[PDB]
Amino acid sequence: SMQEEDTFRELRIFLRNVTHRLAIDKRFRVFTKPVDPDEVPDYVTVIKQPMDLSSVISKIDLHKYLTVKDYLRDIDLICSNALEYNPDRDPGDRLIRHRACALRDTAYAIIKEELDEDFEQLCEEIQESR
Ligand SMILES: C=CCNC(=O)[C@H](CCC(N)=O)NC(C)=O
Ligand SMILES: [Cl-]
Fold it and tell me: Which tissues does it occur in?
């Protein structure tokens, strides 16, 4: 219905605002664009499901997220991809891991403070109806 379309539109406006707040934080610059194969040709061979915040915006705009849980799965991928590709004890890998954990924690903290649980439950029930 039109009222369900309006619910998904509100979801996309909420997700674009959360994503923009993460993307303008200087700690998370490395996560704003896909990894360039020039710099990192083994990336695409190790990480099978690359994800970054520009890809998340594109997904929102293609109507790929119908719940905040689905969006958070892609934020969790940005985090777990960085834990898997950069697992060493050296400071460059530790800094990327701590920035990726902090992205994930920040997205979950904004959602805890600003997502109404009844709005998420509504989205979940429309999704499940389809
Ligand atoms: C799992 C997310 C966070 N990762 C971290 O805590 C990183 C260190 C990496 C480690 N030893 O795991 N932060 C630092 C350097 O303090
Ligand atoms: Cl830096």
Answer: Highly expressed in estrogen receptor positive breast tumors and in osteosarcoma tumors.
Elucidation method: X-ray
Starting from the CA of residue 96, give the closest ligand: 1
- Structure token digits, residue 108: 């979950």
Say which residue the tokens 């009844």 belong to.
Answer: 118
Burial of 68 per CB tally in 10 Å (0-12, 13-18, 19+): buried
Alpha helices in 67-90 (DSSP H): 68-85
Q: Which structural domain, as residue segments, surrounds residue 34?
A: 1-130
**13: Cβ below 6 Å to ligand 1?**
no
Backbone φ/ψ region at 63: left (φ over 0), alpha (ψ -120 to 50), beta: left
